[PDB]
């Protein structure tokens, strides 16, 4: 049972909480697979080895259209290799925001697939615990292809050490300690909630606040977009989001619910908008943040940032790359108050996360992107800088930002061409065709 003789590694594919996904080619069978590489040094193993191996064997025995099929498992002296089938379609929410129309029917199909997979896995007595939209992938880029869930049953054995974006979906019983499979349902519920509103039912500025909200267990449907949503869906959400597990609806029961039953043979535009805002700011938001960072800093800020950036830009090309980011990281953090005693590997890892704040994805971090990093969001997106920015964008001072004004500030000046119209619409909540300060602020602060 050895990896190198069985599979061949090529290039990194995706980012996982427990380990990193890499595309691999097979020696003898000549097929492409996806391997999750988990580090014994980086992550802790909760259960003993034999238990993990047993669970993995059971997983290798299993098969369902809505779960990630697990082919092989390899244990290296240093690392763990978890081999399964490949996925090219990417995460679900991205595909959702890619499309123009999103109705309760689509969400019903999605949740049906999810709950089907969940029901199968529960039939074999397996619990995910950590269920997120990221764990929902599409096997192919083809439209209306079905969903496959990944990292099923791995959470029980591993606990990561890196942590905001799992608090939205975690179940109260999981937070309090011991739990059963129904926690997954709760998680699914949360997703469904988002799917219909584009906002988390339990929300907060940071992990602590979000966890406070979910632990309190209280939530509402007061948001305006819920007026566009049928009552049955809200009822199903209520049954899924009950604090006490025994009273909570099971996955199998939920699969036969009235909502999912009926809606599987209007458009929730504000919802999908809020999903786009939720997701990576694939919007006017990135351009606005970059503009604010590069052009709207005070003299002291510009001086300090330019100085530090010069110190980190070793070859002086005007870009920061992986190596320069690594060599300059500890000193940058030393500058930002917050790490002398930092292991080279976690330094490379955090440097990689910052490489995930590389908006244009050219592989380099510019000065503007760098300003987002060096300046905490509290300062860069203060009330003052936001107001000044909005005032700059709003030339005629009407109180709203027009498409033409956006085209004027940072524009090739194609007001038509559906460029600026599409870019505007992604932020235009009330559909007046303009951006008031509320929407600008919500855009840059991910607020609802």
């Amino acid at each position: 049972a050895i990896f190198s003789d069985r599979y061949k590694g090529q290039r990194v594919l995706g980012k996982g909480s427990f380990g990193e996904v890499i595309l691999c080619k097979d020696k003898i069978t000549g097929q492409e697979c996806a391997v999750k590489v988990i580090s014994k040094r980086q992550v802790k193993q909760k259960t003993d080895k034999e238990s993990l191996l047993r669970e993995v064997q059971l997983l290798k025995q299993l098969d369902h259209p809505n779960i990630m099929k697990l082919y092989e498992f390899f244990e290296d002296k240093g690392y763990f290799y978890l081999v399964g089938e490949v996925y090219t379609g990417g995460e679900l929410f991205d595909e959702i925001i890619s499309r123009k129309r999103f109705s309760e029917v689509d969400a019903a199909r999605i949740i049906r697939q999810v709950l089907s997979g969940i029901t199968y896995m529960h039939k074999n007595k397996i619990v995910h615990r950590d269920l997120k939209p990221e764990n929902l992938l599409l096997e192919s880029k083809s439209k209306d292809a079905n969903i496959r869930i990944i990292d099923f049953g791995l959470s029980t054995h591993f606990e990561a050490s890196k942590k905001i974006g799992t608090a939205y979906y975690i179940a109260p019983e999981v937070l309090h300690g011991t739990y059963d499979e129904k926690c997954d349902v709760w998680s699914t519920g949360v997703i469904l909630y988002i799917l219909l509103s584009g906002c988390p039912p339990f929300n907060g500025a940071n992990e602590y606040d979000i966890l406070k909200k979910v632990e309190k267990g209280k939530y509402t449907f007061e948001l305006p977009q819920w007026k566009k949503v049928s009552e049955s869906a809200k009822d199903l959400i209520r049954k899924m989001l009950t604090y006490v597990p025994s009273m909570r609806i099971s996955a199998r029961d939920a699969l036969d619910h009235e909502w999912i039953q009926t809606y599987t043979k209007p458009s929730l535009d504000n919802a999908i908008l809020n999903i786009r805002q939720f997701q990576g700011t694939q919007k006017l938001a990135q351009a606005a943040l970059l503009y604010m960072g590069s052009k709207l800093t005070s003299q002291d800020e510009t001086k300090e940032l330019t100085a530090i950036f010069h110190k980190m830009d070793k070859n002086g090309d005007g870009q920061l790359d992986r190596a320069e980011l690594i060599e300059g990281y500890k000193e940058l953090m030393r500058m930002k108050g917050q790490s002398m005693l930092d292991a080279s590997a976690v330094e490379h890892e955090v440097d990689q996360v910052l490489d995930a704040v590389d908006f244009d994805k050219n592989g380099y971090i510019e000065y503007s992107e760098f300003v987002t990093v060096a300046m905490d969001r509290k300062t860069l997106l203060s009330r003052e800088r936001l107001e000044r920015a909005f005032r700059m964008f709003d030339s005629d001072n009407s109180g709203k930002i027009s498409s033409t004004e956006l085209a004027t500030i940072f524009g090739v000046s194609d007001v038509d061409s559906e460029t600026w119209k599409s870019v505007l619409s992604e932020v235009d909540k009330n559909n007046d065709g303009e951006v008031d300060f509320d929407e600008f602020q919500q855009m840059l602060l991910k607020l609802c």
Partner: nanobody
Framework: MQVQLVETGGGLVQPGESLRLSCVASGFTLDHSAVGWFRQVPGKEREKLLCINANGVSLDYADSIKGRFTISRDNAKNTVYLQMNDLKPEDTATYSC????????????????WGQGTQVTVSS
């Protein structure tokens, strides 16, 4: 005066020839400016070509112009140069230059003080 960049050196040339373009700053100095050259073909969005910081050079464009175009800098003469070699019928377009503070960006929209540019035409 007011603040703008002016381009010169635009003309008609045979394929495979060489041409030199100039960008002069009026109303401000290039001392703290990173200047980049961009080419726009009619009905197409502006394309990053090259950029020079206050000092160093970056090849922003796709590698189609790599090794053929050089960007130069003379602060005293307030001028940025673009040396174009081995011209192709692919290269004919409007060439203009823009400036951002200190460091060369790779987002077109962070640039300012755009110029009317110069017509560069390669024979067909």
């Amino acid at each position: 005066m007011q603040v703008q960049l002016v381009e010169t050196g635009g003309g008609l040339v045979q394929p495979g020839e060489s041409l030199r373009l100039s960008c002069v700053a009026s109303g401000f100095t290039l001392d703290h400016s990173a200047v980049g050259w961009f080419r726009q073909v009619p009905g197409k969005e502006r394309e990053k070509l090259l950029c020079i910081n206050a000092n160093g050079v970056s090849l922003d464009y796709a590698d189609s112009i790599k090794g053929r175009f050089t960007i130069s800098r003379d602060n005293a003469k307030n001028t940025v140069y673009l040396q174009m070699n081995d011209l192709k019928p692919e290269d004919t377009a409007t060439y203009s230059c823009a400036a951002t503070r200190e460091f060369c960006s790779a987002y077109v929209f962070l640039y300012e003080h755009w110029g009317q540019g110069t017509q560069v035409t390669v024979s067909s």
